[PDB]
Nucleic acid binder design. Structure first.
Length: 158
DNA sequence: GGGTGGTGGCCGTTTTCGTTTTTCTGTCTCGTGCCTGGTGTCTTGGGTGTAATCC
């Protein structure tokens, strides 16, 4: 970030390539690059099913999960979460007023608030609930699969 | 119903160039004293002076 490279053959060529630009610090702060480093400036640079992942988007941010099914297009990956639902207690959400999490129990939703499709698979307000676990189409940008440090609650649960 | 979009949330973040008194501290060209290698001055004695005559 903040570093811009221009491939020229003379210093004044770089000067005029960066001249006439207001998005450039007025200083001519330019440094040469070693032969080995030339290719190092253009180097471009772990998502598996059953991989423990966390969410960062919308209301369910910061919730660990399991990647369930990846779409053929390669942009959206299904997740297995522990729902955070209110059972119609205050329906008449964000990432700061959210109550705690708990696996879907069909009995509670039936008693308080529901189209049963298969055994354990419940479609509730556009949400997929398999065996009490939250299923929804999560965009790959919304999820973290690398560098996840499991917490105490995850050891207790996972 | 579903496409387009203001939106509230979330998320993380910088850059046009536009005064006063002292003591202590660290450089500073500048100077001086030194020094050593080419050189300085002495003085003896024999050659280079000199002088006549031969032949």
């Amino acid at each position: 970030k903040g570093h811009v490279y221009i491939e020229a053959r003379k210093a004044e060529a770089i000067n005029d390539a960066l001249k006439g630009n207001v998005n450039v610090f007025s200083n001519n702060s330019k440094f040469l690059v070693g032969i080995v480093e030339y290719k190092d400036l253009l180097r471009p640079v772990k998502l598996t099913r059953g991989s423990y992942v966390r969410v960062k988007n919308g209301k369910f941010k910061g919730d660990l999960a399991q990647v369930d099914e990846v779409l053929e297009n390669g942009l959206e990956a299904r997740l297995k979460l522990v729902p955070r639902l209110d059972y119609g207690k205050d329906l008449s959400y964000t990432s700061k007023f959210r109550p705690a999490q708990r696996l879907f129990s069909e009995a509670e939703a039936r008693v308080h608030e529901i189209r049963r499709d298969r055994d354990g698979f419940v479609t509730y307000g556009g949400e997929e609930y398999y065996e009490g676990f939250l299923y929804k189409t999560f965009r790959l940008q919304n999820l973290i699969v690398n560098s996840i440090n499991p917490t105490l609650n995850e050891l207790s649960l996972f």
